[PDB]
Ligand binder design. Structure first.
Ligand code: ADP
Lengths: 490, 41, 261, 41
């Protein structure tokens, strides 16, 4: 029923959707903030429309009403939220349906279910999945530090429902920070403490459901390499997980989702220590790193999302999913995002014009375009992501290698990138082994042994340049006189 | 059109080559793009 | 000459395949082949006839790598370094465990202007943008920005290959990619390849070598429509050769207009 | 070095800007390149 589709997003994930939709013979429509005037994803759809000549780029991709307005103006049959704006927001999904538009996603009740970390705590337990022990609900009413104290187990923490906390009343008095944080960046402002599970592997499972009651999983992604908050590198499937452990997690993934009748793609996130696993969160949507999973399975996850939203059945001639036991990984794949986070300098997003730009290609290599191309200007307003790079091979060694060498063959000039950092990671004995946990970055100080690489070329271009414009001392400043050839005997 | 539209930015122009053509450095819809023009002077 | 290569063939019987393979393993066994090689065949219904061997890698190897996940060229190298096929470096699976997941298509973006009868065009590439995303593979050849293409060599700008569980999906993607690439300064065969890729007879699967000669409307082309390309021609004519009946001067600085709607 | 060489072409130097920094347009090994140089009028 979907003739034309709008993407309520920007950047690489917009460009990915446009391509899915393209291949389904579905026509594509893009929106953009004032600050995305010259941004690649605008040019990658059929139509594109400014959101508001007057709406701050900050808030231009979260304005429920104007997005839908722009949608109705153009007979959009469906909106794909992408990730991380209006992607997990019931109000938007509610307002879509009412205006007769198909929100490409799970059901309102799957959004509300999961939008809250508490709502989604209960759901997990009431489907018989392990959970991280924590403040049974959130807290408000203050001195909310002093209580949960000495009753659970040594390692603790303050998380904040959608810091460590090792006690010794480091709780009330690292309870000064909260007024400007979980008010502004998070949804409904609430806070609840959790047993800190030390040295955990971070493993998530990809799931897909049609609207007919068929669910499958596409195995596990290993998201353990991360630097603080955020994910740095993902590998699928997890190189360092035992055959059974991988099962039990995959079974739980599908026990949660079968149990609350999930629909479309979502992801179940787990935390893994030794042989125990725990439920973190669900992500009711596509994630950045889904590329990894497409590579080892062969299933097109985004194409599938759209098709499920159009009422196709998983096992039908059009989505064509293998029965579960036929879904398989074949090899390992890895992802990383080329951004402009400068390693040498406290990982600032950097900001500028890209003058020269060159990717990679061949065996095993897949590039998902983002903000970055020869012409482009990068701005300080959205998270820098120049290119998503993913590689793939029967072996994890071959995979990674294949990655360093296309990190090294890459060339982006005019902004600084995380390439030096990423290269160090791919290179590291710890990563190569597969056994790594989430403290990989903590425990490796070599990783920030960035040193500004010499390049014979640029330096040379900078001399020639100087002399051409401002000449050389004692030498009668004049255009480079034309000299006689005279061949060098040898 | 409705929701289509070109975006052109001119970077520089080169002084003519030996065929008297100049190089325009353009950017149109996020691709660098160059075009040749015979001068008439 | 080969235009578009699919693997594995969407038209072979389970059993034909088995025999057409069974045969290749016995010819090459018999003469104790080493490194990589293509035994070409010719099929006609249920019987088939050996034609050729190519004692080397082939242009269209990528297709076979996509559907099996083997790195043919790398093995080639490893094999020469003297290395057990089933040992560490090559980890090649045993015969009974090699399989072909999904379908994969290739074609060579060349500079064969299919409107001047496929003469390979020459010159300087003034814009180059390819593509990517889901199972698309680009192997670069001669095509880059500012690249310089000569008469002297079999023209090939990019090798483009696509792959997917379904042969239509692998087709839908290749065609998308072709329509996305923008290669300027030179003519290409992209319009012709698009036309092959989109044909009922092709996407069907049953097609013979007579496919092309038996299909007139593959050569149905209108020389590409440019709103964006012709216009640049204008904006940078006026800027230098002026405009007949206006002060040659620079674009004067004009008041900002307010346009009630 | 042995078999490593730089092929460099100077395409244009622009006109100086607000604070006297000219933009050299090079090509160097099949790569568009841009250098910024301080002019001294
Ligand atoms: N209780 C915990 N014990 C150990 N590690 C945790 C705990 N909670 C979160 N983490 C780790 O820190 C990361 C950030 O937490 P999370 O709530 O998943 O943030 P986000 O919502 O940004 O993904 C997680 O990816 C996980 O690896």
């Amino acid at each position: 029923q979907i003739k034309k589709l709008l993407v309520a997003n920007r950047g690489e994930i917009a460009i990915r959707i446009f391509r899915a939709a393209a291949e389904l013979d579905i026509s594509t429509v893009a929106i953009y903030s004032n600050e995305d005037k010259s941004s690649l994803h605008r040019y990658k759809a059929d139509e594109s429309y400014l959101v508001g000549s007057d709406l701050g780029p900050a808030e231009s991709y979260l304005n429920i009403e104007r997005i839908i307005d722009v949608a109705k103006q153009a007979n959009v049959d469906a909106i794909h939220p992408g990730y991380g704006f209006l992607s997990e927001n019931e109000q938007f999904a509610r307002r879509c349906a009412e205006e007769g538009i198909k929100f490409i996603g799970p059901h309102l009740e799957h959004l509300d279910m999961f939008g809250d970390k508490v709502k989604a705590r209960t759901t997990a337990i009431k489907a018989d999945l392990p959970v991280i022990p924590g403040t049974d609900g959130p807290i408000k009413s203050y001195e909310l530090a002093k209580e949960f104290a000495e009753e659970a187990g040594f390692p603790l923490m303050i998380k904040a429902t959608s810091r460590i906390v090792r006690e010794e009343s480091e709780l009330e008095d690292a309870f000064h920070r909260a007024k400007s944080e979980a008010e502004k960046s998070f949804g409904n402002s609430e806070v609840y403490i959790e047993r800190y599970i030390d040295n955990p592997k971070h493993i998530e499972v990809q799931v897909i459901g049609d609207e007919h009651g068929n669910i499958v999983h596409l195995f596990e992604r290993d998201c353990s390499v991360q630097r603080r908050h955020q994910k740095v590198v993902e590998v699928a499937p997890s190189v360092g997980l035992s055959p059974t452990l991988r099962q039990r997690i995959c079974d739980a993934a599908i026990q949660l989702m079968e149990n609350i009748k999930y629909v479309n793609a979502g992801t179940v996130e787990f935390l893994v220590s030794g042989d125990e696993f725990f439920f973190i969160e669900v992500n009711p949507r596509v994630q950045v790193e889904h590329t990894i999973t497409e590579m080892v399975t062969g299933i097109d996850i985004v194409k599938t999302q759209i098709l499920v939203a159009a009422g196709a059945d998983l096992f039908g001639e059009e989505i064509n999913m293998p029965q579960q036991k036929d879904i398989t990984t074949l090899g390992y794949a890895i992802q990383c995002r080329i951004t402009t986070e400068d390693p040498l300098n406290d990982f600032m997003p950097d900001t500028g014009t890209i003058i020269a730009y060159r990717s990679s290609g061949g065996f095993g290599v897949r590039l998902d375009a983002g903000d970055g191309f020869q012409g482009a200007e990068i701005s300080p307003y959205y998270d820098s992501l120049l290119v998503k790079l993913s590689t793939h091979a029967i072996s994890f060694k071959q995979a990674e290698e294949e990655m360093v060498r296309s990190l090294r063959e890459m060339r982006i000039r005019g902004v600084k990138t995380n390439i030096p950092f990423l290269i160090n990671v791919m290179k590291n004995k710890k990563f190569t082994s597969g056994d790594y946990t989430t403290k990989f970055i903590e425990e490796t100080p070599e990783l920030f042994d960035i040193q500004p690489s010499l390049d014979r070329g640029t330096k040379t271009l900078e001399y020639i340049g100087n002399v051409t414009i401002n000449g050389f001392p004692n030498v009668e400043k004049r255009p480079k006189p034309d000299y006689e050839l005279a061949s060098i005997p040898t | 059109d409705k929701g289509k539209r070109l975006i052109i930015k001119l970077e520089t122009i080169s002084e003519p080559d030996e065929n008297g053509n100049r190089t325009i450095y353009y950017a149109m819809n996020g691709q660098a793009r160059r075009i040749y023009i015979k001068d008439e002077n």
